[PDB]
Amino acid sequence: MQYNIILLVDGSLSLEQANQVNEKQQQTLTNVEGLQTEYLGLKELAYPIKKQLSAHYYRWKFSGDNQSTKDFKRTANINKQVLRELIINLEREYGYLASINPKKQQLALQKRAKYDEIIARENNPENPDVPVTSGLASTQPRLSRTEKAQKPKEELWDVVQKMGNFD
Amino acid sequence: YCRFCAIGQLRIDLIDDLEALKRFLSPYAKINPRRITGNCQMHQRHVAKALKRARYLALVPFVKD
Amino acid sequence: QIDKNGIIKSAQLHDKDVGSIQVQVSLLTSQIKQLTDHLLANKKDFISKRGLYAKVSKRKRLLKYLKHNDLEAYRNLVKTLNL
Amino acid sequence: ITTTKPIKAHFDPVADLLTKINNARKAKLMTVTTIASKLKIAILEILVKEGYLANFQVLENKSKTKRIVTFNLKYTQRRIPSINGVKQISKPGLRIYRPFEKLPLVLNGLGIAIISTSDGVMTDKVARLKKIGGEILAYVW
RNA sequence: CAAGGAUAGCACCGGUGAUUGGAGUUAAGUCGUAACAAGGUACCCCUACGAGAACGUGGGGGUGGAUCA
RNA sequence: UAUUAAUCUAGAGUGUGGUAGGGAGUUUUGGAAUUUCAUGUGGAGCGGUGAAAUGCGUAGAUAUAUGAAGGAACACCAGUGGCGAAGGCGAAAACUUAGGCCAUUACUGACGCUUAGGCUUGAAAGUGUGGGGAGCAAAUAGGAUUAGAUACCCUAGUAGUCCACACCGUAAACGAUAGAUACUAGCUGUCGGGGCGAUCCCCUCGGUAGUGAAGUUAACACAUUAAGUAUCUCGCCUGG
């Protein structure tokens, strides 16, 4: 199925040769292909592994047989041209949706209001707004109604009343 | 706290969101609990798994520098 | 999710069914075969074992009730295929 | 007029009705609903005619084939329930059968007993007049 | 065909013994008080190893525990 | 009450959409640790409890740095948190699988409860096998208080341990509480979704700690997160 792969190439090396060897490593996927030729540019490893003070970052997004990415996890991680093969799919805690996209107006609103950049408004980033209307769209309702009204007798004033005039 | 809970996506993944990671991660390369990060509970596990991957990914060190 | 839309829509016991006895037991047995293959491939999976026992016994009591409940609405899947 | 969370099929209507009545007596509830049951309709009607029960109404949803029945457990306007306690003689696992010769009074004769004898439900006292026995379902007062 | 009956491997029930372990039973014998104190070791259960023993002890499980918000 | 033909769908799930989670069988790497070995240094100590000693070191020990490596498991991630048949679940990743949760105006027509019998797993300790043993480690050897220190203190130290096959079957496996059905005030909040709605506040349903009235009770105290009320079955206890 859908597969995004974050690549960790070995040590410090040229960008293009690493791109080519990462393509060769993606070839280890039997049919998980349709890659878009792109990369994340240069990003160094924040800590030396034992002599690797830096590396290069590449992203490969494509789709294919889900069973046939385990062999990639073997080959990329074993062969000394990829160190980490990070895979994205549903087994990792998922939340994606192809129809929840119409919520990026909230994205613009939060980018505006993650920190209030105007002197007039300096509200905390964790304070309410309250245009509230309380939409539900999920109730599990049943429309029970009365059709036969027998024995007219109801209980509405069920609060006690006692102890009349006392001397 | 995370922008993801403020937009609506119900999941995150390591798309090099390191900036917000630095808000959740102390300069000591250790993951602060849910209190500091500010996620509710779901984006909390999302950023937890992302930080653990970054540890594996060498995006963030375990402790070694 | 092995099968969710295959057998309950391609097979109609009555005029129309979205969930019934025999469509459920057919899907249940399809998942039974899938899970038996899975546990033969990986022998240390016991949650599947308990789920399979629950599924097959629920199917058996489904058929038992449907014996008297309807004249004949169960003679399509009362058997097992694992030999 | 359902309370909330419409009642599903219990093991037996009388047990669910008993739970509803005890909860109404305990947690200050007045009107309670139960699953559709002809015997429930009959017992509610006879309790109304007995004077210990308030309004009872059958209820239907968007459709008419399914049904339920609600009723106000008779409360006076000073927070007192007309029904103070119930007991079941016949049980789903043991339907005790008591012929006409086996119809005594209710703990002094003050209470009311109910039997499912031949058709509908009859009070044990009036069942003794028609020399009718049967399986006694409940004692109430 | 009968009551009754033997030669050789088994089979069923009852009883019993050299000696021996545990249970109950001696104001008061005798190793330390392990444990009850957080019995100074918070405790206990399973399980494993030994000291004459309480018991410890290796791992896991539990609150039937202490200052304490 | 078992029920017939049809049944009614309000359940069992199930058509479908959204759907969160440390759920799990399976398979991968990465971090480094650890101690060593090639490498050199260097001068004088290490071990430790209440105090020391047992026990190590110039023939170079402490410590040292990279190279290389064995078994071994992954600081934090860890919550009015969730997923959990129990036992539990967190360096990650994914195959697969399971359980869901919310909603479906829906279907077989209630098609399900417990469990004789049968099936399954089962924390952990440990066992034969083959291999490995990095590390600690009982039993303890030695040593410290000691009237005894056998328990508690320190070092040397193997069974053990560890990987898989086969055997493990118990735990204070608990919720000191086997379940399933149906019902029952609330609240601070919060979690998953349906969500209008920067996030929100705010809710709908299930969940997550407490709460206190009915109710419950020998009292502890529980209370809609009952030790509350009724229906059905398996397990148990009749004083020690």
From Swiss-Prot, chain A:
Listed GO MF terms: rRNA binding; structural constituent of ribosome
Any GO CC annotation of this UniProt entry: ribosome
Entry keyword set: Ribonucleoprotein, Ribosomal protein, RNA-binding, rRNA-binding
Region described as Disordered: 121-153
Ranges of compositional bias, category Basic and acidic residues: 144-153
GO biological process, one term: translation
Family note: Belongs to the bacterial ribosomal protein bS6 family.
Role noted for this protein: Binds together with bS18 to 16S ribosomal RNA.
Protein name, UniProt field: Small ribosomal subunit protein bS6
Organism listed in the record: Mycoplasma pneumoniae (strain ATCC 29342 / M129 / Subtype 1) (Mycoplasmoides pneumoniae)
Full protein stretch here: 1 to 167 of 215
Curated annotation (Swiss-Prot), chain B:
Keywords carried by this UniProt record: Ribonucleoprotein, Ribosomal protein, RNA-binding, rRNA-binding
Record keyword Cell membrane present: no
GO biological process annotation, one example: translation
UniProt entry tagged with the keyword Ribonucleoprotein: yes
One GO CC annotation: cytosolic small ribosomal subunit
Gene Ontology MF term list: small ribosomal subunit rRNA binding; structural constituent of ribosome
Assembly description: Part of the 30S ribosomal subunit. Forms a tight heterodimer with protein bS6.
Record function comment: Binds as a heterodimer with protein bS6 to the central domain of the 16S rRNA, where it helps stabilize the platform of the 30S subunit.
Family of this protein: Belongs to the bacterial ribosomal protein bS18 family.
Protein name: Small ribosomal subunit protein bS18
First and last residues shown, out of full length: 40 to 104 of 104
UniProtKB/Swiss-Prot annotation, chain C:
GO CC, any one term: cytosolic small ribosomal subunit
SMART domains: Ribosomal_S15 (SM01387)
BP terms from Gene Ontology: translation
Disulfide bonds: none
Matching PROSITE patterns: RIBOSOMAL_S15
Alphabetical UniProt keywords: Ribonucleoprotein, Ribosomal protein, RNA-binding, rRNA-binding
Single GO MF annotation: structural constituent of ribosome
Protein family membership: Belongs to the universal ribosomal protein uS15 family.
Subunit structure: Part of the 30S ribosomal subunit. Forms a bridge to the 50S subunit in the 70S ribosome, contacting the 23S rRNA.
Name the UniProt record assigns to this protein: Small ribosomal subunit protein uS15
Organism, scientific name: Mycoplasma pneumoniae (strain ATCC 29342 / M129 / Subtype 1) (Mycoplasmoides pneumoniae)
Curated annotation (Swiss-Prot), chain D:
Entry GO MF terms: rRNA binding; structural constituent of ribosome
InterPro entries linked: Ribosomal_uS8 (IPR000630), Ribosomal_uS8_CS (IPR047863), Ribosomal_uS8_sf (IPR035987)
Pfam families: Ribosomal_S8 (PF00410)
GO cellular component, one term: ribonucleoprotein complex
Gene Ontology BP terms: translation
Keyword vocabulary terms for this entry: Ribonucleoprotein, Ribosomal protein, RNA-binding, rRNA-binding
Function in brief: One of the primary rRNA binding proteins, it binds directly to 16S rRNA central domain where it helps coordinate assembly of the platform of the 30S subunit.
Similarity remark: Belongs to the universal ribosomal protein uS8 family.
Quaternary structure note: Part of the 30S ribosomal subunit. Contacts proteins S5 and S12.
Protein name: Small ribosomal subunit protein uS8
Designated gene of the protein: rpsH
